[PDB]
């Protein structure tokens, strides 16, 4: 995350780190939606033109983290995936359309102060909050630009941008399963997701029940925090039937 801040302890208890077994290494972000499932971007597990195609075992899921590096001895939990499900119609060929994936953790993920699931939106919740101008929050241990990579979870709030502005910011074909966010050129401020933040949740707090909902998944961008450019996110609510289904 660019132009963010260090997260507070227990601010994002659903935040999950996708960790490379060997070479050990941070893959992407993710989110806990149940006590056995994890949400993330399909392209964190499957990107052929770059020969990326991780299996259930080349992987490890780390929950309740704060420090990007350290093994947080009695607060973090590690698990192994029992299976991965990529959206059958994920388009890594055209523009990262339907960039989604679940991970039936193989062993339960007992919760605690730093481990708690985020809510998945309902048609009405999505309806009232997914509006240009409404701010959302993205977290990740991503790049601090285009100490380049942080030491503790980063966080930043970004307004939703109207589809037309989003479309004429790029030459890639935007679909209905995406939405973009960030401040405008003139707005007089920045911030953005960046490399390493992918698969990370984009959340909003519902002013009606005072609950946090995952509206999107960090998918792609064009550079990091450049003027006239925006971050693209998977539209979680439009892909919800697919989610219920594999669950």
């Amino acid at each position: 995350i660019v132009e963010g801040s260090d997260a507070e302890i227990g601010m994002s208890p659903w935040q999950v780190m996708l960790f490379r077994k060997s070479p050990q290494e941070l893959l992407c972000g993710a989110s806990l939606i149940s006590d056995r499932w994890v949400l993330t971007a399909a392209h964190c597990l499957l990107y052929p033109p770059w020969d990326k195609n991780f299996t259930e075992n080349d992987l490890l899921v780390r929950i309740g983290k704060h420090s990007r590096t350290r093994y947080e001895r009695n607060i973090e939990k590690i698990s192994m995936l029992e299976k991965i499900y990529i959206h059958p119609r994920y388009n890594w060929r055209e523009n990262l359309d339907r960039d989604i994936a679940l991970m039936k953790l193989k062993k339960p993920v007992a919760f605690s102060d730093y481990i708690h699931p985020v809510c998945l939106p309902d048609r009405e919740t999505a309806a009232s909050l997914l509006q240009a101008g409404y701010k959302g929050r993205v977290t990740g241990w991503g790049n601090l630009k285009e100490k380049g990579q942080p030491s503790v979870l980063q966080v930043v709030n970004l307004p939703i941008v109207e589809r037309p502005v989003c479309k004429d910011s790029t030459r890639i074909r935007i679909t209905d399963n995406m939405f973009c966010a960030g401040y405008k050129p003139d707005e007089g401020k920045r911030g953005d997701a960046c490399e390493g933040d992918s698969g990370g949740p984009f959340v909003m707090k519902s002013p009606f029940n005072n609950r946090w909902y995952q509206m999107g998944i960090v998918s792609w961008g064009e550079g990091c925090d450049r003027d006239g450019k925006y971050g693209f996110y998977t539209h979680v609510f439009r892909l919800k039937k697919w989610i219920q289904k594999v669950i």
Partner: peptide, 19 residues
């Protein structure tokens, strides 16, 4: 087309990151 790449207009491809 990940966050860290660039524009597709004339040049129809790209390279992976590093570092």
């Amino acid at each position: 087309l990940d966050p860290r790449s660039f524009l597709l207009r004339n040049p129809n491809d790209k390279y992976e990151p590093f570092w």
